[PDB]
Symmetry: D2
Subunit: 61 residues, 4 copies
């Protein structure tokens, strides 16, 4: 009984650590995705700005 | 306690399976993220290429104007 | 009479040439002024393009940082 | 009469020369301006291609995200 109770505490500790690693990993992945979304939006803006410049050049010609 | 032993042994077998599954869940998640990161690195390298090409373009415009 | 006719002929031609020259110099001068203004406008566009390339470079640098 | 004809003939040679010079300058100016324009049109077409390539990149990024 002693031996199985010690193992129970050990397993619970390991499961808690694994819960924590999974939560942390998802948290990180979410933040990565948020940062990447803003880079896409900034890129989209640069494309629009380059297109305005193209239009201005075409106009000057 | 015969009762208590019975109960804790059943619990521990459950916990073993939860832990195995959890570990598998994390590995799957981390593998997916790795594949995501590699695919974006390709995108970054292509972006490098477009930036060099734009720089050449600006240099050619500067030459025409100078 | 031959001398008189020649004089008249050359006077007429000179007057014609002065007009053609005036017209051509005015055309050349306008053309060149327009080309100067065109080049100046393109210079501003080049400066703007450079800013956009710099901002793309920053974006790229930020993507590279995210990818560690 | 003799002085006057000489004067008007010398003037005519002057003007004819000025005309030749102007014809030549107009030709050269027109050529340089056309070449300049054509060369600029090249850079406009290349810029268009870069914008296209960047829009493709943006589309791949968006697809990796969604």
């Amino acid at each position: 009984l002693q031996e199985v109770e010690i193992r129970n505490k050990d397993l619970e500790g390991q499961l808690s650590e694994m819960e924590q690693r999974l939560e942390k990993s998802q948290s990180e992945q979410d933040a990565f995705r948020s940062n990447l979304k803003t880079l896409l939006e900034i890129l989209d803006g640069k494309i629009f700005e380059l297109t305005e410049l193209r239009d201005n050049l075409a106009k000057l010609l």
